[PDB]
């Protein structure tokens, strides 16, 4: 029409499956209202009817659409749609809908009562012929296709209106891709890497003729990696389904099982098949089984197949938009001849999910499981440190099986056969999830976690000037690069916190990594010691590699003096301050990128024995001294520690801070934990005494951590730093800053 009425579709965030959300501006500008129903016309003369909402985050030219209605319009993600207002509510009278035979099989039960009854209960849902909708429940997600509508050809159901569900399920059509297939809505904890992959494979697949009409290099090889069962194959099929490109799947062991010469025929013919059906995506699952390192190859038969794969990768990049996505456990476990340009040039690190990602994964897998009311997936997601998507999927399935196993199978074992009724009535309690997570699932990974820590600036008491310096050093080089370029100054890439142990160095690291929303990699003392004893300092490289793969980052080496004091302290070993590991730290820190937004932070509670060749410019050179707290800071420490625990109101923390002088920040936490221990003991003892009531069951006494509990927890207070150590830090500061 060449005038503005057309919009760009994109992903959705709302849990409603029959609405579209648009930005408050485009709402007033398109001459529409909040809630007003409209027509959405897309490709191939297939339109639909929908409801509109308001969402500040989504931009003007963008329209939230969930996968069901987005697929209904025959359009796919990233395309353009026409929205026309229609306030013509032709309120329905009776609907003729039937399920699909593919999705409905084995499902013994009156589908009307079990699914559609709360679905259309007080639901003003608009329906039009050619719409295949879906409803979830009873460990199932059922598809319904409407054939015959009383108001022709579209209507809106009123709460009064009947719904008429006679007939047999119909066989599926050739031009709707079924919704058991995977889409971007399913992938929970990888919404950031999905951005990279979508921006990489958007133009070659959606707009193929464009790259024919332009001389420019397209991305050909993409290497997904990360630990197994993280969602790589999932991401591949999701991208394939959303962009609509043909998807060929090559399995590593499958090809490697065939006879010598049969496997290479399979590879060649697979590449031929994908070339014939362009646009395409080849997924070579378990690449480290086909093409490992040269040291682990022995025997012609292996190397020959590696060579065949290399030749096919090099050949495909003549006038053939076939992207090849390959998955592997670890990137340095496959043949390095593959990661050279033209074959596998793009590398993506999926990585294990974090707290918010795990909660999202849980919501994805509990989508149609009819959870109980007490189920608080926040607690679960907080207790699943170490789980990947497969672990959480198995956890949800195991909790479901436990709920089927306790009752509702043996209880109705003797009276009546299987039915959908029991499936609806199954509410999986929070205890059930606690059991499934309790013992029956071994978390399958113990790698270095990379995430944005949940610590915030108010979690730390005192240290305000240290906060402004940290904000300056980490923020200013990224948010105002033009000032640094104008004044010629170079931005430093390191800090060295130093001071008494247990005063907030790790807290400050996590806090400044959170405020900038940058990843955080903690490398504790035992790890450096493990690399020193094991004499494998060549792992330090790998560490920095992670910091490059997850940029922007904050690489944090705490207890940096660990090696220095492992071989004796001040006198100690006869040698100098040069170690096997710290030397690799120097080497890798001198040899990183000019500005890759990676900010190394060190920490040491013994700054006198640290290798002085690390305090030189171009390395960790900003010495910040984390001092012992004061009263106006100790109050804040006590408040920030106690704000999670229910404490009484007559307790004075200022008196504590007055009495606890020179207490390091950890002692002020041991006090609170010990007082909490006393309170918990009193609670349990009172519970048992009230259980000795056998004369008559009543509400537990008031659980405010009270005063005169601290009067006992304070009895066993210890100072974890002598005055001598304070004197040592004072001397360090005095000498190194003031001497001459």
Ranges within 4-23 binding its own copies (CB under 8 A): 6, 8
Cβ distance to its own copies smaller for residue 533 or 655: 533
Cβ distance to its own copies smaller for residue 238 or 392: 392
* Chain position carrying tokens 């400050």: 508
Residue 507 labelled as part of a binding site: yes
Where b means 16+ CB within 10 Å and e means fewer, 654-667 reads eebbeebeebbbbb
Give how far the C-alpha of residue 111 lies from the chain's centroid of Cα atoms, to the nearest Å: 36
Cβ distance to ligand ADP smaller for residue 453 or 461: 461
Closest separation between CB of residue 261 and its own copies, Å? 8
Number of residues that bind ligand ADP (CB under 6 A): 35
Residue 503 labelled as part of a binding site: yes
Q: Return the structure tokens found at 150.
A: 């009383």
Closest separation between CB of residue 127 and its own copies, Å? 28
Residue 627 labelled as part of a binding site: no
Q: Return the structure tokens found at 387.
A: 């789980």
Residue 234 labelled as part of a binding site: yes
With CB under 6 A as the contact rule, which of the stretches 70-78, 438-446, 665-673, 729-737 interacts with ligand ADP? Answer: 665-673
Cα distance between residue 262 and residue 254, in whole Å: 11
Closest separation between CB of residue 501 and ligand ADP, Å? 4
Question: Taking CB under 6 A as the criterion, which residues in 220-259 touch ligand ADP?
Answer: 228-234
Cα distance between residue 640 and residue 652, in whole Å: 14
Indicate which of ligand ADP, its own copies, none lies near residue 59 (CB less than 5 to 8 Å, by partner kind). Answer: none
Residue 61, preceding peptide bond in cis (omega within 30° of 0): no
Cβ distance to its own copies smaller for residue 18 or 519: 519
Cα distance between residue 344 and residue 685, in whole Å: 64
Question: Taking CB under 8 A as the criterion, which residues in 179-208 touch its own copies?
Answer: 199, 202-203, 207
Question: Taking CB under 6 A as the criterion, which residues in 302-361 touch ligand ADP?
Answer: 361
Supply φ then ψ for residue 698, to 5 degrees. Answer: -145, 160
Question: Taking CB under 8 A as the criterion, which residues in 421-460 touch its own copies?
Answer: 423, 439, 442-444, 446
Give how far the C-alpha of residue 476 lies from the chain's centroid of Cα atoms, to the nearest Å: 28
Indicate which of ligand ADP, its own copies, none lies near residue 406 (CB less than 5 to 8 Å, by partner kind). Answer: none
CA angle 531, 537, 539 (to 5 degrees): 90
Indicate which of its own copies, ligand ADP, none lies near residue 413 (CB less than 5 to 8 Å, by partner kind). Answer: its own copies
Name the nearest CA neighbour of 553 among 593, 511, 513.
513
Q: Rule CB under 8 A: is residue 731 a binding residue for its own copies?
A: no
Contacts of 519 (CB under 8 A, 6+ apart): 450, 451, 452, 513, 550, 551, 552, 553, 554
Q: Rule CB under 6 A: is residue 666 a binding residue for ligand ADP?
A: yes
Number of residues that bind its own copies (CB under 8 A): 138
Q: Rule CB under 8 A: is residue 537 a binding residue for its own copies?
A: yes
Diameter of the chain by CA atoms? Answer: 95
Contacts of 630 (CB under 8 A, 6+ apart): 462
Find the binder of its own copies among 254, 459, 608, 631 (CB under 8 A). Answer: 254
Cα distance between residue 607 and residue 107, in whole Å: 70
**Angle separating helix axes 193-206 and 232-243, nearest 10 degrees:** 40
Name the nearest CA neighbour of 495 among 611, 590, 614, 577.
614
Q: Rule CB under 8 A: is residue 415 a binding residue for its own copies?
A: yes
Half-sphere exposure of 589 (CA within 13 A, CB side): 26
Closest separation between CB of residue 45 and ligand ADP, Å? 35
Cα distance between residue 311 and residue 326, in whole Å: 16
Name the nearest CA neighbour of 465 among 243, 607, 603, 630.
630
Residue 417 labelled as part of a binding site: no
Cβ distance to ligand ADP smaller for residue 75 or 637: 637
Q: Rule CB under 6 A: is residue 289 a binding residue for ligand ADP?
A: no
Contacts of 567 (CB under 8 A, 6+ apart): 573, 575
Closest separation between CB of residue 231 and ligand ADP, Å? 3
Indicate which of its own copies, ligand ADP, none lies near residue 253 (CB less than 5 to 8 Å, by partner kind). Answer: its own copies
Cα distance between residue 25 and residue 3, in whole Å: 17
Indicate which of ligand ADP, its own copies, none lies near residue 480 (CB less than 5 to 8 Å, by partner kind). Answer: its own copies
Cβ distance to ligand ADP smaller for residue 289 or 390: 390
Closest separation between CB of residue 565 and its own copies, Å? 5
Taking residues 77 to 96 in sequence order and writing x for each that binds its own copies by CB under 8 A, - otherwise, the string is: ---x----------------
Closest separation between CB of residue 218 and its own copies, Å? 8
Cβ distance to its own copies smaller for residue 101 or 199: 199
Question: Taking CB under 6 A as the criterion, which residues in 518-537 touch ligand ADP?
Answer: none
Indicate which of its own copies, ligand ADP, none lies near residue 422 (CB less than 5 to 8 Å, by partner kind). Answer: none
Q: Rule CB under 6 A: is residue 623 a binding residue for ligand ADP?
A: no
Specify the DSSP element, H or E, that contains 379. helix 377-382
Cα distance between residue 466 and residue 552, in whole Å: 21
Q: Return the structure tokens found at 425.
A: 């009535």
Find the binder of its own copies among 330, 385, 632, 639 (CB under 8 A). Answer: 385
Inter-residue contact 52 to 220 (CB < 8 Å): no
Question: Taking CB under 6 A as the criterion, which residues in 170-189 touch ligand ADP?
Answer: 186-189
Supply φ then ψ for residue 135, to 5 degrees. Answer: -140, 145
Inter-residue contact 289 to 296 (CB < 8 Å): no
The SS3 call for residue 406 is helix
Find the binder of its own copies among 105, 213, 692, 699 (CB under 8 A). Answer: 213
Taking residues 261 to 280 in sequence order and writing x for each that binds its own copies by CB under 8 A, - otherwise, the string is: x--x----------------
Residue 233 labelled as part of a binding site: yes
Q: Rule CB under 8 A: is residue 161 a binding residue for its own copies?
A: no
Tell me the three-class secondary structure of 227-270, residue by residue. Answer: CCCCCHHHHHHHHHHHHCCEEEEEEHHHHHHCCCCHHHHHHHHH
Cβ distance to its own copies smaller for residue 143 or 286: 286
Q: Rule CB under 6 A: is residue 551 a binding residue for ligand ADP?
A: no
Cα distance between residue 190 and residue 544, in whole Å: 22
Cα distance between residue 558 and residue 505, in whole Å: 8
CA angle 234, 235, 240 (to 5 degrees): 100
With CB under 6 A as the contact rule, which of the stretches 16-24, 204-212, 389-397, 444-452 interacts with ligand ADP? Answer: 389-397
Q: Rule CB under 8 A: is residue 645 a binding residue for its own copies?
A: yes
Indicate which of its own copies, ligand ADP, none lies near residue 354 (CB less than 5 to 8 Å, by partner kind). Answer: none
Cβ distance to its own copies smaller for residue 182 or 190: 190
Residue 171 labelled as part of a binding site: no
Q: Rule CB under 6 A: is residue 717 a binding residue for ligand ADP?
A: no
Find the binder of its own copies among 44, 45, 298, 692 (CB under 8 A). Answer: 298
With CB under 6 A as the contact rule, which of the stretches 6-14, 38-46, 373-381, 502-510 interacts with ligand ADP? Answer: 502-510
Strand partners, 6: 82
Inter-residue contact 134 to 125 (CB < 8 Å): no
Q: Rule CB under 6 A: is residue 400 a binding residue for ligand ADP?
A: no
Q: Rule CB under 8 A: is residue 701 a binding residue for its own copies?
A: no
Name the nearest CA neighbour of 580 among 601, 554, 611, 553.
611
Name the nearest CA neighbour of 47 among 19, 83, 15, 21.
83
Question: Taking CB under 6 A as the criterion, which residues in 408-467 touch ligand ADP?
Answer: 460-462
Annotated binding site: 228-234, 329, 365, 502-507
Could you list the residues that contact ligand ADP (CB under 6 A)?
186-190, 228-234, 361, 364, 389-390, 393, 460-462, 501-507, 558, 629, 637, 640-641, 665-666, 669
Annotated binding site for ATP: 228-234, 329, 365, 502-507
């Amino acid at each position: 029409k060449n005038r503005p009425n057309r919009l760009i579709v994109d992903e959705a965030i709302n849990e409603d499956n029959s609405v579209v959300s648009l930005s408050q501006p485009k709402m007033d500008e398109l001459q529409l209202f909040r809630g007003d129903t409209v027509l959405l016309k897309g490709k191939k003369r297939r339109e639909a009817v929908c409801i509109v909402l308001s969402d500040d985050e989504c931009s003007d030219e963008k329209i939230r659409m969930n996968r069901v209605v987005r697929n209904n319009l025959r359009v796919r993600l990233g395309d353009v749609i026409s929205i026309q207002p229609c306030p013509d509510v032709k309120y329905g009278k009776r609907i003729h809908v039937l399920p699909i035979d593919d999705t409905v099989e084995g499902i013994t039960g009156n589908l009307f009562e079990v699914y559609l009854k709360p679905y259309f209960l007080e639901a003003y849902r608009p329906i039009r012929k050619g719409d295949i909708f879906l409803v979830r429940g009873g460990m199932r997600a059922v598809e319904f296709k409407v054939v015959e509508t009383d108001p022709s050809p579209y209507c809106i159901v009123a709460p009064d209106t009947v719904i008429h569900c006679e007939g047999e399920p119909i066989k599926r059509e050739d031009e709707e891709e079924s919704l058991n297939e995977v889409g971007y809505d399913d992938i929970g904890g990888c919404r950031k890497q999905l951005a990279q992959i979508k921006e990489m494979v958007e133009l070659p697949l959606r707009h193929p003729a464009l790259f024919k009409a332009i001389g420019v290099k397209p991305p050909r090889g993409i290497l997904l990696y990360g630990p197994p069962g993280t969602g790589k194959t999932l991401i591949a099929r999701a991208v394939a389904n959303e962009t609509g490109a043909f998807f060929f799947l090559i399995n590593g062991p499958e090809i490697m099982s065939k006879l010598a010469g049969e496997s290479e025929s399979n590879l060649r013919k697979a590449f031929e098949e994908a070339e014939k059906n362009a646009p395409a995506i080849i997924f070579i699952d378990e690449l480290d089984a086909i093409a490992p390192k040269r040291e682990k190859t022995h025997g012609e038969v292996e190397r020959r197949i590696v060579s065949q794969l290399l030749t096919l990768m090099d050949g495909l990049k003549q006038r053939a938009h076939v992207i090849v996505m390959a998955a592997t456990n670890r990137p340095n476990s496959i043949d390095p001849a593959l990661r050279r340009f033209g074959r596998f040039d793009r590398e993506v690190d999926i990585g294990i999910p974090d707290a918010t990602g795990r909660l999202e994964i849980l919501q994805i897998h509990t989508k149609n499981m009819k959870l109980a009311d007490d189920v608080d997936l926040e607690q679960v997601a907080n207790e699943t440190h170490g789980h990947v998507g497969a672990d959480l999927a198995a956890l949800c399935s195991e909790a479901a099986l436990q709920a089927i196993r306790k009752k509702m199978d043996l209880i109705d074992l003797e009276d009546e056969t299987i039915d959908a009724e029991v499936m609806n009535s199954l509410a999986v309690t929070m205890d059930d999830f606690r059991w499934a997570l309790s013992q029956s699932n071994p978390s399958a990974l113990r790698e270095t976690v990379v995430e944005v820590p949940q610590v915030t600036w108010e979690d730390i008491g005192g240290l305000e000037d240290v906060k402004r310096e940290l904000q300056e050093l980490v923020q200013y080089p990224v948010e105002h690069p033009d000032k640094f370029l104008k004044f010629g100054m170079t931005p430093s890439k390191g800090v060295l916190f130093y001071g008494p142990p247990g005063c907030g160095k790790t807290l400050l690291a996590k806090a400044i990594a959170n405020e900038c929303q940058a990843n955080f990699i903690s490398i504790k003392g035992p790890e450096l010691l493990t690399m020193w004893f094991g004499e494998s300092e060549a792992n330090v490289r790998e560490i920095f590699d992670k910091a490059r793969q997850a940029a922007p980052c904050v690489l944090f080496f705490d207890e940096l003096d660990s090696i220095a004091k492992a071989r004796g302290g001040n006198i100690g070993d006869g040698g100098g301050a040069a170690d096997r590991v710290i030397n690799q730290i120097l080497t890798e820190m001198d040899g990183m990128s000019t500005k890759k937004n990676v900010f190394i932070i060190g920490a040491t509670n013994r700054p006198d024995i640290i290798d002085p060749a690390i305090l030189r410019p171009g390395r960790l050179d900003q010495l910040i001294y984390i001092p012992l707290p004061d009263e106006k800071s100790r109050v804040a420490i006590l408040k920030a520690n106690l704000r999670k625990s229910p404490v009484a109101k007559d307790v004075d923390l200022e008196f504590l801070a007055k009495m606890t002088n020179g207490f390091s920040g950890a002692d002020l936490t041991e006090i609170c934990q010990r007082a909490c221990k006393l309170a918990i003991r009193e609670s349990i003892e009172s519970e048992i005494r009230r259980e000795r009531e056998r004369q008559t069951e009543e509400d537990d006494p008031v659980p405010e951590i009270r005063r005169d509990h601290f009067e006992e927890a304070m009895r066993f207070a210890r100072r974890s730093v002598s005055d001598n150590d304070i004197r040592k830090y004072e001397m360090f500061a005095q000498t190194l800053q003031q001497s001459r």
